[PDB]
Nucleic acid binder design. Structure first.
Ligand SMILES: [Mg+2]
Ligand SMILES: [Mg+2]
Ligand SMILES: [Mg+2]
Ligand SMILES: [Mg+2]
Ligand SMILES: [Mg+2]
Ligand SMILES: [Mg+2]
Ligand SMILES: [Mg+2]
Ligand SMILES: [Mg+2]
Ligand SMILES: [Mg+2]
Lengths: 100, 127, 102, 213, 83, 155, 14
RNA sequence: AGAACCUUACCUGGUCUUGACAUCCACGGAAGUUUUCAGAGAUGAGAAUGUGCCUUCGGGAACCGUGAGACAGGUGCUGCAUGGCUGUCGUCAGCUCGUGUUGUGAAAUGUUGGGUUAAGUCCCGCAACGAGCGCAACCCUUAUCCUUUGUUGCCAGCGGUCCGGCCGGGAACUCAAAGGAGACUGCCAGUGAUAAACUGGAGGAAGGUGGGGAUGACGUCAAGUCAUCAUGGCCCUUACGACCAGGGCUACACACGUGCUACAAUGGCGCAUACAAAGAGAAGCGACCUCGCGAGAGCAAGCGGACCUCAUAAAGUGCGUCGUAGUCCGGAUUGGAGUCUGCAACUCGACUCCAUGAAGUCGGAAUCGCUAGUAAUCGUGGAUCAGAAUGCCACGGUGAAUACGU
RNA sequence: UAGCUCAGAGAGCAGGGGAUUGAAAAUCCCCGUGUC
């Protein structure tokens, strides 16, 4: 992926981090295992105003070195090839060939 | 006293304790007929007995864990075989010939990359 | 129990952890502390599969594994000196240790 | 589409890893990128310092980093002073204090890393590719190496057509994990394309020694 | 579909527009680049120019449209036939 | 099979009658590895067959095979330029296999509420030398009697 | 009908 | 290894230009906060708020913003420019070199001839003699034994027990992860050129390579990838760069490729009910208990995990269950109605419910895999992941038929 | 006289689809083949 796409991604996460507390509490109001009527509706409208990016569903997992949006792995971070690369040269602590 | 044996078929490990009595083969507290269903299973556990003299003169205490009917039943049989040999050191001949002393090393083959199972391969198209 | 502490050593190798294990057990016995045996627990083997090709050809896949070794040692008698010694004691960097009394 | 990386296959038995810091599924992710960034930085600042293996260990609340550097026609004078000012500006990249060792590289010829770096510097200075290979081969053989196998690939000579020459002297086994063959890679950024360099130095079987003891 | 416990979702920009429109009896088409909203009882009889990707299709909200979203009434693909 | 010489795999006898012949039969009849349902259908079918004709299960079963079992088949040998259908005698072990195979095939073909009902009537007809299963034996023999002229070069 | 009647009861109408 | 928006590179609607990212100096403002409103959102106005910290009182590190410059920028171009990785022939047994010799010479020889082998594997032979990348072994996993170690794992010998390893007790055994041991063609006999090898036989958990997995020789295909990345040259550069609102990537007269599920009574449901492995889990898994057709939800224990959690194994069995019907087969499709995931569920998610109940009764020519725990089978798990598997990857359970032979 | 070429609206040829072809003709199958 291009450098620009990585720049857009870090902006998405940064905006979500700043409003993380507000989103957590606001959604709590909208539920409370069945809550109010008007209060609930106002909370919904507030979330709308609230910058889209701030939503944690607006982030795409990308390689921390290249930004590839596909083939990501939570564990080991990196990406498909990137894992290998580090593991292959001997930077990953423990990976090797599996012959079970 | 106690006579011990270890059996293993696929993934089941069986602990056998032999002591004389009135048969009543107990498998994990439950009774024989209860633990085993399919007639074939019960027949194979008792194969060494009929093969030798103590068909039911002694008793068999069995604890088994893991695997399924086959594995569990087969491991119980294998444990009885080794334990009778330890008790008499003379049943080898008949037991060996009956291929009972041999540990069945057949295990579930691991799945391989590019195949849906151990050996089955996705359907191939020539052109 | 009687203030007993259990020490869990976690590493990624099959040698380093055993070598470090000797240090943590020999020391206690040397200074006269009863340390429970290095009981071995199942070595977690996480299995990963990754596409080795940047594009098509999805049969050229590679198999990786992580073997997490976790040894555990229990010292029933928590004598002050031995406990304090094990704390300050430095262990091989490769291995990692989770010191928890409970 | 063949020939696996000999280091990786032997990363458990024989070859050791370049990072041995245990972790979980949380902190691990971060630590990796920080290690990535520091290594690339150091390689740029010491590409002329005959660096060979920048071992990075992360002890409990520590990041001990080692460097297999020496001097490839330059110096070891205030190089350690530089390394200091470097770690002053590096330790902050990932936080936590840092302790730096310098595992001197005896007989640099036997280290495939160093040899490939030297060869690529020549290629940048436009040195007859054929000459370079023969020199490196002879240097390793005389200094004592059971076998050497160097490969050159890319737009050698400048022409638009590919090529892949390779010279081999002595035994360079690659199917016996009981060996100790080092396989560094180098991307020489010559004017025409990016000539690549890979060198195998079969230093000798570790039969008795087993791993990197 | 959307959970019943959360009620209907409407965009505030469109929502603000209809408020002004109803209090003034405006008949001009409502310009909107959004389709995620739902049909409200207070938009009955208005004409809204719903974007489809390149242009804004005017849709006249009727009584039977209550409860549906704006998106179901603005086809996005222009398809006549394959022959 | 180019070089690897294969012995013979031993099969466990059936749990009820201790017969190697019947243990093979349920294996051929078995589908999707569901042995337990296979012998249940077969055993109930054998009970019907034994009562419908008086004879013991084992003796009645053997007679039906003996009346359907073929003795000669036609192999396909690419003699010289063009292949011809060479009649060849079949080994006794293979005889049992083909007989049991046809029975299972003919069973599934016949229409009956329960396959048990099928197997029973099928074996019964076979003992009487009638039915679809025995019809194959004449057809196989007719093929090997019309082509009996090519009986001087075999494989 | 019902399109509005449904909306009325289903939603709290805030 | 997972398009609702995100992604996205696509369209299109609107913003924009030393640029989002990138330096360099001056410049201004600490930064930063909180809110208002323009507006689809980008972008655009407003405010209030703080105004720092480093020493020093200048300069600062910053940071945010202006301008100038140089530059930035392209998932633009070229895989017939490359690196690099990868496919492939093929785990096929080959490929070579040195030196000598021979032949004018390209070459040959070695490397082949007679044996043998999974093998250029070994043996005789011999103008060759040596060597090396392969093969084999060295690795991991499984199979049996030992030692070491008893956890939360274990429960034999213990007695008391609530019958619950539960709880004392213990270390037997299971289990586990370290050290090991062990199969060697060794042994025994036979055959073969007194060989190599083979053959049977004993012993032995294990026999010839015990079973897998890893490991791909020199090279081939100017194979594929510039959209991972790097990179060479060209081209672009108020735009082929960039932002953001909506759509497209799920479009359908159409053909193929790969899965899934059925065409049934091995079923078909009902109830009772037995037995696994492998994993994963901390804003996660979530016991429970309560409510809810269900889906769910409340309620909230514990659990960083041989402890707790996902969690139900299902194939199977026990009796009953219907009678060949488009079926109590199968059962797509829809007309709706709930929950749940998420700014957000229409395009274009997944699951639960109502109602609907098709095609399909074993599929022409053709064509696939597979020779043992294999095929066939039946679950479960896991990565990806807000949510979204018949895909992939793993893990159990059950469990065949057949090989004369070339 | 089925789109040709002949029939009394049949057959074949040609059509499409599936095969088979390194790959195309050829061939194999399946289907559609008309105001007499
Ligand atoms: Mg998402
Ligand atoms: Mg989209
Ligand atoms: Mg190419
Ligand atoms: Mg020569
Ligand atoms: Mg050789
Ligand atoms: Mg090998
Ligand atoms: Mg090409
Ligand atoms: Mg191409
Ligand atoms: Mg698609």
């Amino acid at each position: 992926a291009k450098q620009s796409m990585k720049a857009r991604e870090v902006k998405r996460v940064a905006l979500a981090d700043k409003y993380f507390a507000k989103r957590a509490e606001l959604k709590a109001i909208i539920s409370d295992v069945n809550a109010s009527d008007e209060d609930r509706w106002n909370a919904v409208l507030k979330l709308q105003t609230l910058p889209r990016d701030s939503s944690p569903s607006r982030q795409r997992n990308r390689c921390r070195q290249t930004g590839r949006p596909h083939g990501f792995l939570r564990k080991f971070g990196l990406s498909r090839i990137k894992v290998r690369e580090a593991a292959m040269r001997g930077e990953i602590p423990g990976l090797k060939k599996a012959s079970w | 006293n106690q006579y011990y044996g270890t059996g293993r078929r696929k993934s089941s490990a069986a602990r056998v304790f032999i002591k004389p009595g009135n048969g009543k083969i107990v498998i994990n507290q439950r009774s024989l007929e209860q633990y085993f269903g399919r007639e074939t299973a019960r027949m194979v556990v008792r194969q060494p007995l009929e093969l030798v003299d103590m068909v039911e003169k002694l008793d068999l205490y069995i604890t088994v864990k893991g695997g399924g009917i086959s594995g569990q039943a087969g491991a119980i049989r294998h444990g009885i075989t080794r334990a009778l040999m330890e008790y008499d050191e003379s049943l080898r001949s008949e037991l060996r010939k009956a291929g009972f002393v041999t540990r069945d090393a057949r295990q579930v083959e691991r799945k391989k990359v590019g195949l849906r199972k151990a050996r089955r391969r996705p359907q191939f198209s020539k052109r | 129990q009687n203030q007993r502490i259990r020490i869990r050593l976690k590493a990624f190798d099959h040698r380093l952890i055993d070598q470090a294990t000797a240090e943590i057990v020999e020391t206690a016995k040397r200074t006269g502390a009863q340390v429970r045996g290095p009981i071995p627990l199942p070595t977690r083997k996480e299995r990963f599969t990754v596409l080795i090709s940047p594009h098509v050809n999805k049969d050229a896949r590679d198999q990786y594994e992580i073997r997490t070794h976790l040894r555990l040692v229990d010292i029933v008698e928590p004598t002050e000196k031995t406990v304090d010694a094990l704390m300050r004691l430095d262990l091989a960097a490769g291995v990692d240790v989770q010191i928890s009394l409970g | 589409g063949q020939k696996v990386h000999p280091n990786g296959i032997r990363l458990g038995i024989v070859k050791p890893w370049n990072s041995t810091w245990f972790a979980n599924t949380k902190e691990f992710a971060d630590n990796l990128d920080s290690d990535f960034k520091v290594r690339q930085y150091l390689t740029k600042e010491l590409a002329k310092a005959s660096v060979s293996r920048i071992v990075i260990e992360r002890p409990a609340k520590s990041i001990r980093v080692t460097i297999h550097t020496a001097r490839p026609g330059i110096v070891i004078g205030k190089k350690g002073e530089d390394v200091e000012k470097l770690r002053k500006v590096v330790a902050d990249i990932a936080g936590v204090p840092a302790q730096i060792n310098i595992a001197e590289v005896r007989k640099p010829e036997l280290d495939a890393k160093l040899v490939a770096d030297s060869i690529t510097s020549q290629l940048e200075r436009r040195v007859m590719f054929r000459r370079a290979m023969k020199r490196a081969v002879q240097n390793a053989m005389r200094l004592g190496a059971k076998g050497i196998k160097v490969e050159v690939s890319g737009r050698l000579g400048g022409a638009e057509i590919a090529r892949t020459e390779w010279y081999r002297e002595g035994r360079v086994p690659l199917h016996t994990l009981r060996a100790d063959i080092d396989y560094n890679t180098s991307e020489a950024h010559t004017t025409y394309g990016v000539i690549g360099v890979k060198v195998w130095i079969f230093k000798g079987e570790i039969l008795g020694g087993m791993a990197a003891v | 579909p959307r959970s019943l416990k959360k009620g209907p979702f409407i965009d505030l920009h469109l929502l603000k527009k209809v408020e002004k429109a109803v209090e003034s009896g405006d008949k001009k088409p409502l310009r909107t680049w959004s389709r995620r909203s739902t049909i409200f009882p207070n938009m009955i009889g208005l004409t809204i120019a719903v974007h489809n990707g390149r242009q804004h299709v005017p849709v006249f909200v009727t009584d039977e449209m209550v409860g549906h979203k704006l998106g179901e009434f603005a086809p996005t693909r222009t398809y006549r036939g394959h022959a | 099979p180019r070089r690897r010489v294969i012995g013979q795999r031993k099969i466990l006898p059936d749990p009820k009658f201790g017969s190697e012949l019947l243990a093979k039969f349920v294996n051929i009849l078995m589908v999707d590895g569901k042995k337990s349902t296979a012998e249940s259908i077969v055993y109930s079918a054998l009970e019907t067959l034994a009562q419908r004709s008086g004879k013991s299960e084992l003796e009645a079963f053997e007679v039906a095979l003996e009346n359907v079992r073929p003795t000669v088949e036609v192999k396909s040998r690419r003699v010289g330029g063009s292949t011809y259908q060479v009649p060849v005698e079949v080994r006794p072990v293979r005889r049992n296999a083909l007989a049991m195979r046809w029975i299972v095939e003919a069973a599934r073909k016949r229409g009956d509420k329960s396959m048990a009902l099928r197997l029973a009537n099928e074996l019964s007809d076979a003992a009487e030398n009638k039915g679809t299963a025995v019809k194959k034996r004449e057809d196989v023999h007719r093929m090997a009697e019309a082509n009996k002229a090519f009986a001087h070069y075999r494989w | 009908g019902g399109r509005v009647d449904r909306f009325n009861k289903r939603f709290n109408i805030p």
